[PDB]
Amino acid sequence: CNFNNSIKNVIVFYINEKALIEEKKMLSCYENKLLNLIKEDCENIMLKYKPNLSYICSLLKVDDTSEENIKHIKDQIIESLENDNRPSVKLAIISLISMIVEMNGYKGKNIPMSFLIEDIALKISENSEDLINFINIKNK
């Protein structure tokens, strides 16, 4: 009955944007500083190790956005972080997921991507002191 997905996409984006704004306001001063350090580091990783990350994305077949494959990607990343949980690798995974979202996009409509983000962030937050130690040592 005469649907218009351009309307739908704009509304989804508009509301998501309003939510991101709210989440930003709710970030504490400590979280904001943390966010700034993570952004600088992971964008730096994006620059220097783009060929390494692009290769990972090829291995994971990120172009394939089927539910079956997005889960295979999550499980692979999760299991990788388990067998190698160094702070350095955790930061590369953040950069990696940044590359994935920039390649295929993410409106939240894809719930499996939501699980990937949540579970990986949780794993990265484990043994926090090792990660904070690595980050602050990096900013000198």
């Binding site: 390494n52 990972i56 291995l59 990788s80 190698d84 160094r86 350095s88 930061l91 590369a92």
Partner: peptide, 21 residues
Amino acid sequence: STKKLSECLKRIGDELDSNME
């Protein structure tokens, strides 16, 4: 391919660790 992923991530980590110095 599971081991191939771990190898690439390990190198990235290894390089970041040394560049930490």
